[PDB]
Ligand binder design. Structure first.
Ligand code: FMN
Ligand code: FMN
Ligand code: W7P
Ligand code: W7P
Lengths: 313, 313
């Protein structure tokens, strides 16, 4: 059996890719993801200028998952654009570029430059709504008027199909409001659910200490902690955005976990913490595992079960 | 070495108690919690009228935690008021009564009648703000104007010290706003962080099905999934509300997990999922485990380490 699929006018060998931020910051990292058996790759979220990010330690992993406050360390937009425009081998797999400007104007400036490269090479845009804390106002995707502005301005500046990386929501009225915003924008063709579960706190009992330096130890959670949160957001948006694709991200360690994301509605499945921990060999294992669960069930395609999670009565 | 605490004008043998909703709905449950080694108990969140709650299955547990959409099944306010006024033996341990009216008026009506019993018998109010108000609006504690209204009205109607049960928040801006609202109300003497992580989705791979019947399988998450989120909220509020107590709730299965809560700032420590799963014998184990960590570290009292989590530089 093979796991090959088409979307967004691209062909993918399988639905797996890295999550933005993991194994994708340097040319080395991008070449390593390209060499992997993933179906696609996404670059590190970038800003107009390079950033060193926050002080170390800024990432830690544990049996149940990870916590991070990286601070958007990246080599700057010119680097990632050059990678997309000159260095990436599109014959190997599709590329998505993640942008995370600190204002609307910065995002507009980047997407205007990306548009012709998207037209000529087929690089895909993932717009990351998460950002550093600004005292006195919420994260963009938790401020629905700010979100609507970002999407209206990016849509106008870019003019081509793109996606948006969302933080998790926890309230059905928030799902309803966020999806209504997203559905105002026909160029938003995919929604990736989810970014890390914001501002957790991991404490080491022995040392009586937080485990990351920035933000007094507060950082985004990934991994096993967040799988049911991720599945709920994937499904909520799959149900609310029938003209869009949903990409699942959060808590994938196994083909089974990927299977659940796809049942919930995921088209592509992104792997963050488990990729950081296991390395790019994980992609062959996830493919093998997903194909085994399909075989056991009699499914020959992903479309035969995508979004088909069953409810009770 | 000593687990005693003396707060809110009561004395507690140890900081452990059930989380509202677990082992606290019937007189049988309340007598069981009173018989246990817990330092306190809290009754099931109640409404003016008795409620049957949602259809079953509405709770499920797994290795990493639980999901529920119970729908506020309870025996009605009058039952819990009678338990507090006439049945509970206050010589065993202190009692908290949790109230979760479906409108501000409902809460005002209950607290008016609870007041004289609170004054005479010393039952302590926990007001649940992580609950529905109007369908299509967020839960109360996610709607800061509604939250302010509920607290103004309850403070005026009740007129005695009380506490509040908060959902988890995920954005620093929400910690900031939420704590600022709470600090407007001097009668709010304790803040219990956290209720369940809202609207997750657990899917069973073999059956391809959600595991709870209400809300298309969406429900609040408890247990191992939510410990870092719980710690973050306990510490966030600990830092922002220096004139209030913080009670920790979420992901406690062991004396080590309780130790982390207390380092974060917790006074009382509540136990939901793990208590549901293990039963009331858990309290002896948690006591023993916490005392063993204290002994190893040379801590004689809880106040020697409460709130003393270390940050890095
Ligand atoms: C070290 C690290 C860096 C990340 N950087 C980004 C990023 O630059 N942009 C982004 O959209 N998400 C970023 N994330 C979030 C992940 O893409 C992903 O949404 C999250 O980790 C949840 O997936 P997981 O459970 O597989 O880890 C980062 C995650 C980690 C652990
Ligand atoms: C079956 C069930 C019933 C619950 N009912 C209530 C409730 O009536 N009021 C309330 O404040 N919280 C309720 N909760 C939330 C718990 O009090 C607790 O905040 C949550 O489960 C997190 O703690 P844990 O990780 O120890 O489970 C309920 C939890 C469960 C599992
Ligand atoms: O708190 C910060 O300093 C902060 C928070 C989020 C971001 C956006 C980039 C990002 C990061 C990161 O670079 O810290 N980590 C994630 O889990 N998700 C992300 O989207 C960037 C910075
Ligand atoms: O979705 C609902 O119908 C809903 C959500 C929350 C409540 C309040 C009672 C409650 C419940 C409950 O009875 O479902 N479960 C929790 O995990 N925490 C709670 O505070 C009650 C009902």
């Amino acid at each position: 059996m093979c796991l090959k699929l088409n979307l967004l006018d691209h062909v993918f060998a399988n639905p797996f890719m890295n999550a933005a931020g993991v194994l994708c910051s340097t040319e080395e990292d991008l070449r390593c993801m390209t060499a992997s058996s993933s179906g696609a790759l996404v670059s590190k979220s970038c800003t107009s200028a390079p950033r060193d990010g926050n002080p170390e330690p800024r990432y830690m992993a544990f049996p149940l998952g990870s916590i991070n406050s990286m601070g958007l360390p990246n080599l700057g937009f010119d680097f990632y654009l050059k990678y997309a425009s000159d260095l990436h081998d599109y014959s190997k797999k599709p590329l998505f570029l993640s942008i995370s400007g600190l204002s609307v104007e910065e995002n507009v400036a980047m997407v205007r430059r990306l548009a012709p490269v998207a037209q000529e090479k087929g690089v895909l845009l993932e717009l990351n709504l998460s950002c550093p804390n600004v005292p006195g106002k919420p994260q963009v995707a938790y401020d629905f008027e700010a979100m609507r502005t970002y999407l209206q301005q990016v849509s106008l500046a870019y003019g081509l199909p793109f996606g948006v990386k969302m933080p998790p929501y926890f309230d059905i009225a928030h799902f309803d409001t966020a999806a209504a915003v997203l559905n105002e924008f026909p160029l938003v063709k995919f929604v990736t659910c989810v970014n890390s579960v914001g501002n957790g706190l991991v404490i080491d009992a022995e040392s009586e200490s937080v485990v990351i330096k920035p933000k007094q130890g507060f950082g985004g959670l990934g991994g096993k902690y967040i799988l049911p949160t991720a599945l709920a957001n994937v499904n909520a948006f799959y149900r609310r955005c029938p003209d869009k694709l949903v990409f699942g991200c959060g808590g994938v360690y196994s083909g089974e976990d990927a299977f659940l994301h796809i049942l919930a509605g995921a088209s592509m499945v992104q792997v963050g913490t488990a990729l950081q921990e296991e390395g790019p060999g994980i992609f062959t294992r996830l493919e093998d595992e997903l194909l085994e669960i399909m075989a056991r069930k009699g499914y020959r395609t992903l479309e035969e079960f995508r979004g088909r999670v069953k409810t009770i009565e």
